Design a protein around this ligand. Structure first.
Ligand SMILES: OC[C@H]1CN[C@@H](O)[C@@H](O)[C@@H]1O
Ligand SMILES: [Br-]
Ligand SMILES: [Br-]
Ligand SMILES: [Br-]
Ligand SMILES: [Br-]
Ligand SMILES: [Br-]
Ligand SMILES: [Br-]
Ligand SMILES: [Br-]
Ligand SMILES: [Cl-]
Ligand SMILES: [Cl-]
Length: 836
């Protein structure tokens, strides 16, 4: 890289509750709450009813200190810069008697010149964190109304006054832990001549023949003299130079703007997951002053075009992604913070979450606007997994202030994070907020405030989301799409709006609509829809003692943040399943339910391309142990929904859909190549494994690239009696001309509660090696929605939550670093076992 030296300020930190003068070791990056936990000064916040027990923290102020040594040689470098990648939130930063900074925005990184303030020998850094509650109580007192941020779990809704992660105040799947601290790294850089403050690789054009780039650098030179320099940009792939360009300059004191064009002939394109390789070039910019490289900065760069097509059409207004010139059906989910305490999220946890997205056939993730702008690692992993990123700005579900001071704060954060993120191949679009305009129009605020205050909120909306944010995107990321809000117009109660742009269809769940409604209530793009489940028993055991395994234990209830939820789960369960008498069986069936219902929607959305061009379910993941809409619980365990999403998002899918006592079969493909001379084969099998009638064959089928087409239709009457529909299933298989199987599905003709499932034992043989367990499962009769349950937290399965078919063996590999060459406890559940 270059001649600079970096000192990480990540050890030797102490913290103190202000006014106590009592100090203890801290971990940085970190949080006040974690530091307290680490010294048993707080109980496990996620356990039982500990939520109320930890709230006192947000009322105190907190101080952090560290000491470090600087040598005479270090102090003689031309420049010395202290960088805070993140301070949560109101932080007075002192070094050696100087107030360097009064921080006030969790989402902004600060770079501070400190050479003239540093001393040879010991140097003392000291940070005072004002309570974000006590900082904002006087601001609320001045305001004369309470903003309607119902997810802020306090009588006074103070969240809206602070540029701090909205979810930290609470959410409808989240614990309240209003934390503070040095939440991202602190670095001291000792350098000569200059630093590169920003490097932007701006793609000017891209064809199969040529990529044209403009390398835009901002160089901050710290010395008083004029300094001859050569700027060099090297473009490489897998360690081999593809192109190199240079420019002679003379760097002036202060900011210098340097622009070097570069071209890449016959570029290797970045493709999204499912369509090819997510190829990334390495672009390195260096400043050379004579022999020495005084500054260097690199980015991984993907060469691709992303256009968001949002245009008036015959159906209303389209909303879809075109990637490298091809309409790409979006398949993915909404991402929330992985933890209540952000610095606790490790590299390994980020890697695993991406492995979970990639393995479920996803190509998109929405970074929802009540969390954070994610760390750099998150976007790097999106780049290398070919996952497009929809980035909200951090505003959600409430109007916000719009006074000049506040807007200037927000402007700083928008500029910072835009420049931080704009080089990522995965970055697809920006969205001003989550649900704010929908809130303003439909959530009844006009009965909560004076007409004057309401008008003020409406004008304040425009100032921020229709003016400041789009203008900032236009200036700093001019070829990326921005939309002011998600959903921008469509509302779930208003079918007339559903052909316009993206939908959050909360008809299912909030409107109590059955999952079958998802076949009829179609959006142009589904940016949210969802259904809750209790996480599995090992996760419940992590927050509850066995006496508090009920639905409505006090316990229990502390881990259900919606209000609404437990009763809705039982209501929906009764529609399709027998409600089990035991809590453990209810948990298992609720997982099955969430997975089955949701996959029915995912299937409808893809089936109804091109009217519908994407589906992002609510929600991928959890921030703590809780009952929620997630497909993956806090401990990384896949719920049934994650396996079902994987199946529903398979590049080629056979989709049987039965409505009005009739069956249709669609073939759905997101491949880039067309498949020709295909055969769909079907057969009706009873629960004892006996074929009813004969095989049905449909030959000569084509499955064009990026299409959903019906290839088969039949009435049930005259084919199967009501009795057969209760006692049999349909096997569907698709094969190429040579008879190689490319897809398979199973279809049931009745609701699970209406099936005549036989009593059955699932037997298994277990071959255990290191970190691995191979089970071979057998049942002579159908075992419905089987759940292979192990007590090992985070264990991975090759499959789970599937129907084990009569007399058809099935191999499942379980993996975990904790499986020893044995021995693994296995409990196999299936539907019939849940009642008598
Ligand atoms: O209520 C579930 C979710 C609905 N919409 C999302 O944008 C989130 O605010 C909620 O947690
Ligand atoms: Br300096
Ligand atoms: Br600086
Ligand atoms: Br300049
Ligand atoms: Br009011
Ligand atoms: Br706009
Ligand atoms: Br169906
Ligand atoms: Br039907
Ligand atoms: Cl505890
Ligand atoms: Cl980070």
């Amino acid at each position: 890289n270059d001649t600079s030296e970096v000192m990480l300020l990540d050890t030797g930190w102490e913290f103190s509750q202000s006014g106590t003068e009592k100090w203890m070791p801290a971990t940085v990056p970190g949080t006040v709450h974690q530091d307290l936990i680490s010294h048993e000064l707080l109980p496990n916040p996620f356990y039982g009813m500990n939520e109320k027990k930890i709230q006192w923290v947000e009322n105190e102020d907190w101080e952090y200190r560290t000491s470090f040594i600087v040598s005479e040689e270090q102090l003689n470098r031309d420049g010395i810069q202290l960088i805070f990648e993140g301070l949560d939130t109101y932080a007075d930063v002192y070094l050696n008697g100087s107030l360097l900074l009064k921080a006030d925005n969790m989402f902004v990184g600060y770079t501070l010149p400190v050479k003239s303030v540093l001393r040879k020998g010991e140097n003392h850094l000291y940070i005072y964190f004002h309570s974000p509650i006590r900082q904002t109580l006087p601001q609320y007192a001045s305001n004369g109304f309470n903003y309607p941020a119902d997810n802020d779990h306090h009588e006074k809704h103070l969240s809206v006054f602070s540029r701090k992660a909205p979810y930290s105040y609470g959410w409808d799947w989240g614990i309240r832990m209003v934390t503070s601290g040095v939440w991202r790294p602190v670095t001291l850089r000792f350098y000569d001549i200059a630093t590169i403050s920003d490097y932007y690789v701006r793609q000017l054009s891209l064809t199969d023949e040529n990529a044209r780039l403009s390398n835009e650098l901002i160089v901050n030179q710290i010395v008083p003299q004029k300094i001859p320099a050569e700027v060099r940009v090297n473009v490489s792939l897998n360690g081999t130079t593809v192109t190199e360009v240079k420019q002679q300059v003379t760097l002036q004191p202060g900011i210098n703007h340097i622009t070097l064009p570069a071209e890449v002939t016959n570029p290797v394109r970045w493709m999204p997951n499912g369509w090819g390789t997510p190829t990334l070039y390495d672009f390195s910019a260096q400043i050379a002053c004579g022999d020495r490289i005084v500054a260097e900065q690199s980015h991984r760069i993907g060469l691709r075009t992303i256009r968001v097509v949002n245009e008036k059409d015959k159906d209303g207004e389209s909303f879809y992604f075109e990637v490298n010139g091809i309409p790409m059906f979006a398949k993915g989910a909404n991402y929330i913070p992985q933890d209540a305490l952000l610095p606790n999220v490790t590299t390994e946890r980020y890697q695993t979450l991406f492995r979970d997205m990639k393995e479920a056939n996803m190509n998109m993730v929405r970074i929802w606007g009540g969390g954070t702008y994610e760390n750099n690692l998150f976007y790097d992993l999106a780049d290398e997994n070919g996952i497009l990123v929809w980035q909200d700005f951090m505003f959600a579900c409430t109007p916000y202030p719009s006074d000049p001071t506040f807007l200037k704060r927000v402007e700083a954060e928008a500029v910072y994070n835009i420049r931080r993120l704009r080089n990522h191949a995965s970055l697809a679009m920006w969205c001003g907020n989550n649900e704010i305009l929908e809130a303003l129009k439909y959530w009844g605020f006009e009965k909560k405030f004076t007409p004057e205050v309401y008008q003020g909120l409406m004008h304040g909306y425009d100032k921020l989301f229709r003016e400041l944010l789009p203008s900032t995107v236009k200036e700093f990321d001019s070829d990326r799409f921005y939309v002011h809000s998600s959903p921008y117009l469509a509302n779930w109660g208003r079918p007339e709006s559903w052909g316009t742009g993206d939908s959050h269809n909360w008809g299912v769940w909030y409107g109590k609509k059955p999952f079958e409604s998802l076949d009829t209530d179609l959006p142009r793009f589904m940016s949210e829809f969802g259904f809750q489940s209790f996480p599995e028993m090992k996760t419940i055991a992590a927050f509850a003692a066995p006496e508090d395994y009920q639905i409505e234990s006090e316990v229990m209830n502390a881990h259900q943040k919606s209000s609404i939820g437990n009763s809705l789960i039982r209501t929906y369960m009764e529609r399709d399943y027998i409600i089990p008498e035991s809590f453990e069986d209810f948990v298992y069936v609720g997982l099955v339910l969430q997975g089955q219902g949701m996959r029915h929607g995912l299937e409808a959305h893809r089936r109804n391309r091109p009217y519908c061009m994407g589906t992002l379910y609510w929600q991928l993941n959890d921030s703590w142990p809780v009952v929620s809409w997630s497909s993956i619980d806090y401990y990384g365990n896949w719920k049934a929904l994650h396996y079902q999403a994987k199946r529903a998002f398979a590049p080629v899918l056979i989709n049987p859909i039965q409505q009005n006592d009739s069956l249709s079969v669609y073939l759905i493909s997101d491949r880039l190549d067309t498949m020709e001379q295909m055969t769909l084969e079907m057969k009706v099998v009873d629960f004892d494994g006996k074929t009813l009638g004969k095989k049905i064959q449909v030959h000569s089928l084509e499955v064009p690239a990026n299409t959903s087409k019906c290839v088969y239709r039949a009435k049930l009457d005259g084919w199967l009696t009501p009795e057969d529909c209760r006692r049999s299933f349909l096997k569907l298989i698709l094969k190429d001309k040579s008879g190689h199987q490319v897809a398979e599905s199973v279809h049931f003709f009745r609701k699970t509660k209406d099936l005549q499932l036989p009593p059955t034992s699932v037997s298994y043989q277990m071959k255990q090696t290191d970190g691995k367990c191979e089970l071979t499962l057998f049942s002579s009769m159908l075992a419905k929605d089987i759940f292979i349950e192990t007590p090992l937290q985070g264990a991975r399965y090759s499959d789970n939550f599937f129907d084990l078919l009569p007399g058809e063996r099935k191999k499942v590999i379980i993996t975990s670093p904790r499986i020893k060459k044995e021995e693994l406890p296995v409990n196999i559940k299936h539907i019939r076992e849940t009642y008598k």
